[PDB]
Amino acid sequence: EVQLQQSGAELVKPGASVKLSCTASGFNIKDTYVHWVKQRPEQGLEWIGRIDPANGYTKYDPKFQGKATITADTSSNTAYLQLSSLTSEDTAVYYCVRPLYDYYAMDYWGQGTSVTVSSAKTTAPSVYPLAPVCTGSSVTLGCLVKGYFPEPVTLTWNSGSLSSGVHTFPAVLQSDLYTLSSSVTVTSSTWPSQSITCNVAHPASSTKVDKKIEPR
Amino acid sequence: DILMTQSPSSMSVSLGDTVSITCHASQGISSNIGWLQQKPGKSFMGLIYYGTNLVDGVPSRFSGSGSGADYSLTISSLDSEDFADYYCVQYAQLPYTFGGGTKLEIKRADAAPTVSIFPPSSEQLTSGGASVVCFLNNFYPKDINVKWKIDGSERQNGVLNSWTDQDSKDSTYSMSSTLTLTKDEYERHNSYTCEATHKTSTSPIVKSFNRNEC
Amino acid sequence: GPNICTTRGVSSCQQCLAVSPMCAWCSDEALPLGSPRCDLKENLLKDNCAPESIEFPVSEARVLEDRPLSDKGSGDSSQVTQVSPQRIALRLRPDDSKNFSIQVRQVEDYPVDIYYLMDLSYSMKDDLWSIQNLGTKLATQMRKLTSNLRIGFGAFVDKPVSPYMYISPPEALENPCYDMKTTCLPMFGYKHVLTLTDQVTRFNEEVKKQSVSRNRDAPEGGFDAIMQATVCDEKIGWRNDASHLLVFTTDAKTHIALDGRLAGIVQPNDGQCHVGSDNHYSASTTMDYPSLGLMTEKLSQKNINLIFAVTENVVNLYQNYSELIPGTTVGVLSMDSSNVLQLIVDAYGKIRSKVELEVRDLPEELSLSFNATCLNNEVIPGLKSCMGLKIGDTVSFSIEAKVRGCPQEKEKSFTIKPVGFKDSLIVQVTFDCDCACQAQAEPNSHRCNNGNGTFECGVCRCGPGW
Amino acid sequence: LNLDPVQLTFYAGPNGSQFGFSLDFHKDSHGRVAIVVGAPRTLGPSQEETGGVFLCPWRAEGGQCPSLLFDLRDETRNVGSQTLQTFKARQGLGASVVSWSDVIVACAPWQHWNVLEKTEEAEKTPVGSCFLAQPESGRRAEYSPCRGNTLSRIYVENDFSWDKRYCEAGFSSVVTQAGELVLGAPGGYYFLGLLAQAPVADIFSSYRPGILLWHVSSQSLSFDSSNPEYFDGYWGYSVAVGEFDGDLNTTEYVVGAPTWSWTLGAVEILDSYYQRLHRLRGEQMASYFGHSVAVTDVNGDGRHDLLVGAPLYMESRADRKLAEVGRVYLFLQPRGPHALGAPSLLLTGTQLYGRFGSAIAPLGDLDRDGYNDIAVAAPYGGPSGRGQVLVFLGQSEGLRSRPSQVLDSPFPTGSAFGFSLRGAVDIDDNGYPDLIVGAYGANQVAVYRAQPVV
Ligand SMILES: *[C@@H]1O[C@H](CO)[C@@H](O[C@@H]2O[C@H](CO)[C@@H](O[C@@H]3O[C@H](CO[C@H]4O[C@H](CO)[C@@H](O)[C@H](O)[C@@H]4O)[C@@H](O)[C@H](O[C@H]4O[C@H](CO)[C@@H](O)[C@H](O)[C@@H]4O)[C@@H]3O)[C@H](O)[C@H]2NC(C)=O)[C@H](O)[C@H]1NC(C)=O
Ligand SMILES: *[C@@H]1O[C@H](CO)[C@@H](O[C@@H]2O[C@H](CO)[C@@H](O)[C@H](O)[C@H]2NC(C)=O)[C@H](O)[C@H]1NC(C)=O
Ligand SMILES: NCC(=O)Nc1cccc(-c2nn3c(=O)cc(N4CCNCC4)nc3s2)c1
Ligand SMILES: *[C@@H]1O[C@H](CO)[C@@H](O)[C@H](O)[C@H]1NC(C)=O
Ligand SMILES: [Ca+2]
Ligand SMILES: [Ca+2]
Ligand SMILES: [Ca+2]
Ligand SMILES: [Ca+2]
Ligand SMILES: [Ca+2]
Ligand SMILES: [Ca+2]
Ligand SMILES: [Cl-]
């Protein structure tokens, strides 16, 4: 079976360089062309270039000229993508791709390798409890995780206990640091009668703080 | 470079539906097109190559057609797994180029947002910062708008929004708006509000609270 | 006493002569009671056998044409004699044999045709430049050997067809050197340029106007050109009474029969001339390369001496081909053909340094034996070829014919000829196994069983139908 | 011995098509035997020669045959900023045919190919190409393993290594019992010759019309070389398969290279990875040793034997003279792990220029005595030079040195009777294996039916 194992997520500083790898599994890397593609949320999908691992001949989109360097080592059935002078815009997910039958097609894809460029140093998240103001039948609480880096973080309530009826929103980049929030809803008979705690773990800084929600 | 215009950007359909995604090229590419699929939070999978040819392993409910500079992906009888992102790619010329993409989303009944506002925390305040949070939960469709007012006047700077992907077993969306000020600046005012504007109600759903009071 | 003649008890004069060449027969009427008519000629006369009643054939050999050997090959329209005698009569009786001689000479100042067949692929560009004064240079050196020189020129590359020929872009058909920075001729297979002439500056001037072409694969189509230069007599202009030298110059491997299939050509070579008024080989793209055997047949048939003048990188290759095409010679050609003059002169010498006899139309019954006399009256038994000879030298051979029995036909003739030579010795054979008195027999003779028999050569013979 | 030369069957194609240039037996999913026939010069659409294939149902009276239709149109694909082109004019479709299972493989060794890019190009060259058909289902596929998309400049800079531009894939062909197609490509790697192999199943499932350059990943090509002994050796001129290493799981290849080592000629036996097991050298330069190769067990010991034809071998004759007559060599496979040795038998032609050994066909066991037999063609042999096919019977010691039967060409001069041959199949189901003989020069095929021994 054809599988393209790409290297692990990369987290580097601006101006640095990084070299991603894509290893052929269940086949010979030298069989077909190998392409690299960049994906960003807003900008979308961009073709970087291809290499013919059999001989080392490459092609690029002139946009990535001088930035990307594609190579391959048939000996280790692996292909590489080297990025230089990394910036904040180079932050994206990178895929290696090869065709199935058609010489020129893009059929098989690697799982992807995330690349994050930032100067931020590993910072622990500040956890804040969110209680409502001083009425209805159902109540809602929240938890605010502000100023942490890098990702990710694991947020739970009552240590995984309270599960159903929760909303943990995607993190957002607040000036080189991430912010995240989570909402949960129950009945007035459940709060503030039953104790509810917020549990956020930041493995990066290895900090697992916990904040119980308090009424006003 | 060949421009690939992929429409529509999104569509809200139901299971068993038969839908079609079109792709328009800035010039003729004579079937040198491919179709891709990206299940939510996953990698890509090949669907079609050379206009009409199914990638090995892909179900036949998927079909490709078109010629010249106009091509279509068509899924007959939508399945639950078929709800994902779809892109087209032309390889008639270098550089290869992609389409804007299309996201198939589940269709359901309209639902107004459950708005909830939360003042700053003690801890945060005794730290010098002040954030007012606003939760707009379980609404439909996704097209929603939030507005912050400080003492009746709109506020735009310092606002960070965050949306969720369509929830699995209710097919609704949620949003999170956070206004962040400086303790000092937060105390120059008294009234804090966020207005939600959804297609459900003609009047914006409002939620406020007053500092120095409860 | 009783010899094999008498102890055989022959029934007729004919059966008497078939016992042994030494036996004789007496057709005399007055012969004693029990006297054996079949006995030694001496025993017969000793019995008062009428001398004319003796039937005793003797095997002889007398010359009918004995022109003397010429001293010069110049002059004449070839009244030159180089083999002597030219015709002899041979008479043999049953199971007998007779010896005779033939002389052979390598005449001086014999005419010479030299056709220069040149590879004109791109690696021969430098070569083409070198030989542009060869016609006159060569004339000067051969002038020392012959006073009738003629020279001519032909060229070749390969079958102008894919994949030998480059067929794109369109420009490559008009100029195969398009992708380089010069201009050369479109692809051609074989073209005749200059018919054999004694006007040697025609050679120089023709060569100055020649240029190379270019094709894709190393082995070339020279063998096509060797075939055409050989079978297109009138066009090449080979002379009847002259040595024919075909000089083949190349620096590369060659294509051979069955290679053509790589170009979709399967039709075997027909050995015929296909060079018309345009002087190009027209079956080049429709007919396969010729096989060694076929080449050998035509070379030999037209008395062409092929010279492989090739560079050292392929000399072993061509020496090995030469061994499958007897009479062919090989010389080492420098990378620019600057030494081809001496090469040709050395080959000419080597060629006229051998005399090998060949027999044609020898009756089954007749077997021959040879004793050669080369160098200095040194007789080499069982040998019918000489070597290390210099132009002007003369050799001779002693021959004996041995007949086995007596054949049904009494008049046969065969030929003995040196290979490559114009002249030859015609031997007219006559088998003498009958008796003169047979040509005056008496059928149904009144003497023989009263009509039931025939009377001939003294005795009675049972008639036909008995 | 017991082939019937009195009542033959004749099949005929269009004039000038070279119908009979190549042939083979074909069985349908029901086991009904028919005859596939190549006609390399059949007229195409533009009234231009492209070659063609015919599928003849078996009938004692013979006659005309229906076409096996293939796409005869030139193709163009603009993709990856390049222009791919196939040229089918004079491609010689049907220059070889072979049947395996319910599938027919017909090749066009001289189909041309080119890729354009701006002002550059790969060059228009004869990569060759094979067409595959499943007659009963109408399925079609192609296989063209030498097509590439590299430009000229690159080959020149790399000193012409791995240059498959003149392959002529399908020049010869054979299929393993397991259904692996093996193509001979005598022009591969700048005229060294290469072999291309791929499973029939994978050729079909990976092919789509209009792609032109596609990957068949289970495929396997032979290798280039810097050894001059191989230059212009046309490795792949002929091909065959058999068992020569004792291991029934592995299949071995037999490849003819008639001009190997400066036209000495050779044939080699290889494993499925193209590693050399044995090499047999020609006996005489230019004899075209390896022109044809045949595999069959002739002495009934269950071990495949090899036969090699050298149709231009010159026999030595009285007075230091040579006579081109052609020759065939027999090599019996020895017991256990051992290398083939000197040939066990030499068969030499008689008619001058007759080309004895031009084709060699296993007949199976013709006279049913327990030993497999062969037929050797001399396409220009016989006292009339019209062509002959000679049958040799197997025996415990190898082959009989004298032919048990001689079939004289029923066609006119120039027919090339015997140029293609095929036996070992019972076409009329009488329990005796039969012989088909092509005479492309006469655009006909003759069928000889084997009969009970008289
Ligand atoms: C023109 O024709 C000549 C003559 O045939 C060819 O030269 C011969 O080439 C063959 C094949 O390469 C040689 O065969 C080898 O013979 C060796 C022993 O030969 C001895 O005697 C000769 C006499 O001069 C010496 O030159 C030589 O050095 C030796 O003293 C063997 O040792 C070789 O065995 C090897 O190869 C064989 C397979 O070929 C294997 O079975 C062995 O295991 C081993 O690997 C070999 O048999 C032969 O020596 C050459 N003969 C002569 C007289 O030189 C030219 O190649 C040919 N040229 C062209 C271009 O066609
Ligand atoms: C060729 O030479 C041989 C000797 O090498 C000759 O043979 C001799 O012939 C004479 C004839 O008188 C006999 O007496 C000898 O007995 C023979 N010698 C031998 C050794 O056989 C032969 O005559 C010569 N042949 C020709 C045609 O001239
Ligand atoms: N006289 C016409 C001519 O020579 N034209 C000509 C022009 C331009 C190139 C060549 C070549 N000939 N040639 C060979 O013979 C072998 C070879 N190999 C490389 C790959 N490995 C196998 C050996 N490569 C080449 S390139 C030949
Ligand atoms: C035959 O040989 C003898 C010598 O024994 C010789 O004298 C004679 O000339 C030869 N015969 C002929 C016809 O040459
Ligand atoms: Ca030169
Ligand atoms: Ca050539
Ligand atoms: Ca095996
Ligand atoms: Ca055997
Ligand atoms: Ca038998
Ligand atoms: Ca039968
Ligand atoms: Cl050249």
**Helices and strands (H, E) in chain A, number of each type:** 0, 19
Domains for chain D: give ranges and CATH numbers: 1-454 (2.130.10.130)
The count of CB pairs under 8 A between chains B and D is 19
Instruction: Find the helix or strand (DSSP H, E) in which C340 lies.
Output: helix C340-351
Please tell me the total number of residues recorded for chain B in this structure: 214
Helices C340-351 & C134-142, crossing angle to 10 degrees? 40
| Residues C249 and C271: beta-carbon distance below 8 Å | no
Q: What separation in angstroms does the CA of D355 have from each of D280, D281, D311, D408, D418?
A: 20, 19, 4, 14, 10
Matching residue, tokens 């937060």? B186
Task: Give CA–CA dist D373/D364, Å, rounded.
Answer: 6
**Token representation of residue B137:** 């939960």
**Token representation of residue D454:** 């008289």
Q: Which residues pair with C194 in a beta bridge?
A: C153
Mutation for D interface: C266, C301, C308, most D CBs within 10 A: C266
Domains for chain A: give ranges and CATH numbers: 1-119 (2.60.40.10), 120-213 (2.60.40.10)
Q: Do C293 and D314 touch (CB under 8 A)?
A: yes
CA angle A185, A189, A193 (to 5 degrees): 95
Cis peptide bond N-terminal to C169, omega within 30: yes
Closest Cα to residue D185, out of D224, D231, D136, D127? D127
Question: What region, left, alpha or beta, does residue B143 occupy, with left being phi > 0 and alpha being psi -120 to 50 degrees?
Answer: beta
The identity of residue D338, as a single letter, is H
Quote the ligand 1 centre to A167 CA distance (angstroms): 86
The identity of residue D102, as a single letter, is D
Q: Which residues contact C303 (CB under 8 A, 6 or more apart)?
A: C244, C420
Question: How many C-beta atoms surround the C-beta of residue D427 within 10 A?
Answer: 22
Helices C292-301 & C222-231, crossing angle to 10 degrees? 30
**Token representation of residue B4:** 């690939």
Q: What separation in angstroms does the CA of C438 have from each of C5, C434, C457?
A: 19, 7, 6
**Token representation of residue D66:** 């229906």
**Token representation of residue C401:** 């014919």
The SS3 call for residue D3 is strand
Contacts of D157-166 with CB under 8 Å at 24 or more apart are D160/D190, D161/D189, D161/D224, D162/D189, D162/D224, D163/D189, D163/D190, D164/D127, D164/D188, D164/D189, D164/D194, D164/D221, D165/D113, D165/D122, D165/D123, D165/D125, D165/D127, D166/C163, D166/C216, D166/D125, D166/D126, D166/D127, D166/D190, D166/D191
Measure in Å the smallest separation between the Cα of A209 and chain B Cα atoms.
14
Closest Cα to residue A174, out of A207, A148, A206? A148
Query: Residue B17 half-sphere exposure, CB side, CA atoms within 13 Å?
Result: 15
Of C219, C296, C326, the CB nearest to D232: C219
| Residues C108 and C391: beta-carbon distance below 8 Å | yes
- Provide the CATH number for the domain formed by C58-106+356-466 in this structure: 2.60.40.1510
Q: Taking CB atoms and an 8 Å cutoff, what residues of chain A touch D215?
A: 31-32, 99-101, 103
Q: Is B118 on the interface with A (CB under 8 A)?
A: yes
Q: Is B124 on the interface with A (CB under 8 A)?
A: yes
* B to A contact (≥3 Cβ pairs closer than 8 Å): yes
Method used for this model?
X-ray
Question: How many C-beta atoms surround the C-beta of residue C409 within 10 A?
Answer: 9
**Token representation of residue A30:** 């030298």
The identity of residue B149, as a single letter, is K
What is the experimental resolution, given in Å to one decimal place? 2.6
**Token representation of residue D406:** 């001689």
Matching residue, tokens 């810097």? D226
Q: Which residues contact B134 (CB under 8 A, 6 or more apart)?
A: B115, B116, B117, B118, B146, B148, B176, B177, B178, B179, B194, B207
Q: Is D124 on the interface with C (CB under 8 A)?
A: yes
Q: Which CATH number fits domain C107-355: 3.40.50.410, 3.90.1150.10, 3.40.50.1820, 3.40.50.720?
A: 3.40.50.410
CATH 2.60.40.10 fits B108-211, yes or no: yes
Q: What is the 3-state secondary structure (H, E, C) of B159-212?
A: EEEEECCCCCCCCCEEEEEEEEEEHHHHCCCCEEEEEEECCCCCCCEEEEEECC
Q: How far is CA C444 from the centre of its chain?
A: 54
* β-strand pairing of D266-270 with D252-257: antiparallel
Q: Taking CB atoms and an 8 Å cutoff, what residues of chain A touch B96?
A: 35, 47, 106
The identity of residue C303, as a single letter, is N
Task: Give CA–CA dist C119/C139, Å, rounded.
Answer: 22
Mark the breaks in chain A: residue after which each occurs, C to N over 2.5 Å. Answer: 134
Measure in Å the smallest separation between the Cα of D368 and chain B Cα atoms.
50
Residues of chain B with CATH 2.60.40.10: 1-107, 108-211
| Residues C310 and C322: beta-carbon distance below 8 Å | no
Closest Cα to residue B207, out of B136, B116, B121? B116
Matching residue, tokens 């799982």? A111
Mutate which of D260, D262, D284 to test ligand 1's pocket (most atoms within 8 Å of Cβ)? D262
Burial C57-95 (b: 16+ CB within 10 A, else e): bebebeeeeeeeebeebeeeebebbbbbbbebbbbbbbb
Mutate which of D125, D155, D156, D160 to test ligand 3's pocket (most atoms within 8 Å of Cβ)? D160
Question: What region, left, alpha or beta, does residue D334 occupy, with left being phi > 0 and alpha being psi -120 to 50 degrees?
Answer: beta
Of D154, D214, D217, the CB nearest to A103: D214
CA angle B108, B113, B117 (to 5 degrees): 160
Chains in touch with C (3+ beta-carbon pairs under 8 Å) read D
Q: Which residues pair with D33 in a beta bridge?
A: D27
| Residues C155 and C228: beta-carbon distance below 8 Å | no
Task: Give CA–CA dist A32/D162, Å, rounded.
Answer: 16
User: Which DSSP string corresponds to D287-331?
Assistant: S-TTSEEEEE--SSSS--EEEEEETT-EEEETTTEEEE--EEEEE
| Fold (CATH) for C1-57 | ligand-binding face of the semaphorins, domain 2 (3.30.1680)
User: Which DSSP string corresponds to A106-168?
Assistant: --EE---EEEEE-----BPPEEEEE------SEEEEEEEEEEEBSS--EEEETTTTB-SSEEE
Task: Give CA–CA dist C152/C236, Å, rounded.
Answer: 8
**Token representation of residue C248:** 């083949």
Burial D218-240 (b: 16+ CB within 10 A, else e): ebbbbebeeeeebbbbbbbbbbb
The SS3 call for residue B73 is strand
Among the bound ligands, the one closest to the CA of D231:
3
Question: How many C-beta atoms surround the C-beta of residue C422 within 10 A?
Answer: 16
Q: Which residues contact D140 (CB under 8 A, 6 or more apart)?
A: D70, D71, D131, D132, D133, D134, D209
Closest Cα to residue D172, out of D266, D257, D287? D257
Q: Which residues pair with B11 in a beta bridge?
A: B104
Q: Is A104 on the interface with D (CB under 8 A)?
A: yes
* β-strand pairing of C459-462 with C453-456: antiparallel
Mark the breaks in chain D: residue after which each occurs, C to N over 2.5 Å. Answer: none
| Residues A190 and A164: beta-carbon distance below 8 Å | no
Which parts of D88-210 fold into alpha helices (H)? 152-157, 188-191, 200-206
Burial A134-164 (b: 16+ CB within 10 A, else e): eeeeebbbbbbbbbbbbbebebbbbeeebee
Mutation for A interface: D164, D217, D220, most A CBs within 10 A: D217
DSSP C268: P
Chains in touch with B (3+ beta-carbon pairs under 8 Å) read A, D
Q: Is B54 on the interface with A (CB under 8 A)?
A: no
Task: Give CA–CA dist C430/C410, Å, rounded.
Answer: 6
Q: How far is CA C358 from the centre of its chain?
A: 7
Residue spans of the domains in chain C: they are: 1-57, 58-106+356-466, 107-355
Matching residue, tokens 């500083």? A13
Q: What separation in angstroms does the CA of D106 have from each of C337, D15, D16, D69, D98?
A: 48, 20, 19, 11, 7
**Token representation of residue B210:** 């007053």
Burial C324-345 (b: 16+ CB within 10 A, else e): bbebbbbbebeebbebbbebbb
The identity of residue C269, as a single letter, is N
The identity of residue C109, as a single letter, is D
The SS3 call for residue D67 is strand
Quote the ligand 8 centre to C5 CA distance (angstroms): 63
| Fold (CATH) for B1-107 | Immunoglobulin-like (2.60.40)
Task: Give CA–CA dist A5/A78, Å, rounded.
Answer: 9
Q: Which residues pair with C394 in a beta bridge?
A: C105
| Residues A19 and A27: beta-carbon distance below 8 Å | no
The SS3 call for residue D133 is strand
